[PDB]
């Protein structure tokens, strides 16, 4: 039973991802997050034993093998009108959107560390056959003591494929111009676009584009002092033509990405 295994705490948030409560696993006081998703809102479904579960459960299981920069699904339950997902909860934690709001534009050394860990997390998803489709600062949690970033909210994701995607329910201001223009995109190159938006967000303090005309226009104005190397990487990730964007390997080999801090160094220098 779900009610006897977990002590439920305050609501942490609610939105397109459902309703998420703080919780504690009774058997060992492990901090958890308890996420409720209404069945009537689940668009894409999957099978595990063939049990019909939300695709989000399928994707979380595929990536929750071992230790990584992805939120770990510990358990899940079916209720009459909803599914309940138990996720491991870092503590203390702050999501990257609130972090950037409070700190402003991030020093490039800190943006490099954060961006590197997000790249490693997204590579892990893709290695496991999972496309997140909603990479953004709001969907990244910072473990403030360990200096580790965790990707959350796979509810807009999909199985990774090499053919074209023609559906999308992620965040429009992180979506690529080929989606805006043609309602078509491929998984990896669209992911790289959202990563370019995320990196601009980190080093400038907010995302570059709010409107469709800006997304498709292909001009990146820098509102903060940003190094030439970082600017080049951002503009490369935000190439209008998807085939002009870097691979994950080219991103991580980029000159701006070298000499990344370890997670614990990042915490000690920037977070503690």
């Amino acid at each position: 039973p779900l009610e006897s295994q977990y002590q439920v705490g305050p609501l942490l948030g609610s939105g397109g991802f459902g309703s998420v409560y703080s919780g504690i696993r009774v058997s060992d006081n492990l901090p958890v997050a308890i996420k409720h998703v209404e069945k009537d809102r689940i668009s894409d479904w999957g099978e595990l034993n063939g049990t019909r579960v939300p695709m989000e459960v399928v994707l979380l299981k595929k990536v929750s093998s071992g230790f990584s920069g992805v939120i770990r699904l510990l358990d899940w339950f079916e209720r009459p009108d909803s599914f309940v997902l138990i996720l491991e909860r870092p503590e203390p934690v702050q999501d990257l959107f609130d972090f950037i709001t409070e700190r402003g534009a991030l020093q490039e050394e800190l943006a490099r560390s954060f961006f590197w860990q997000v790249l490693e997390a997204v590579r892990h998803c893709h290695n496991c056959g999972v496309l997140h489709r909603d990479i953004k600062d709001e969907n990244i949690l910072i473990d403030l003591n360990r200096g580790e970033l965790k990707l959350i909210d796979f509810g807009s994701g999909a199985l990774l494929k090499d053919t074209v995607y023609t559906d999308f329910d992620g965040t429009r201001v992180y979506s690529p111009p080929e989606w805006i223009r043609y309602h078509r995109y491929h998984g990896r190159s669209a992911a790289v676009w959202s990563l370019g938006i995320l990196l601009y967000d980190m080093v400038c303090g907010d995302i570059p584009f709010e409107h469709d005309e800006e997304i498709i226009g292909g001009q990146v104005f820098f509102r903060q002092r940003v190094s030439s190397e970082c600017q080049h990487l951002i503009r490369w990730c935000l190439a209008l033509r998807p085939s002009d964007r870097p691979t994950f390997e080219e991103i991580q080999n980029h000159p701006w990405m070298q000499d990344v801090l370890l997670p614990q160094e990042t915490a000690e220098i920037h977070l503690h």
């Binding site: 939105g15 397109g16 991802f17 809102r41 959107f97 709001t101 909603d134 953004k136 709001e138 909210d153 509810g155 807009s156 329910d169 992620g170 965040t171 429009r172 201001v173 992180y174 303090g205 907010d206």
Partner: peptide
């Protein structure tokens, strides 16, 4: 300049 969250799903 107004920074805001953006919905998804």
């Amino acid at each position: 300049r107004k920074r805001r969250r953006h919905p998804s799903g």
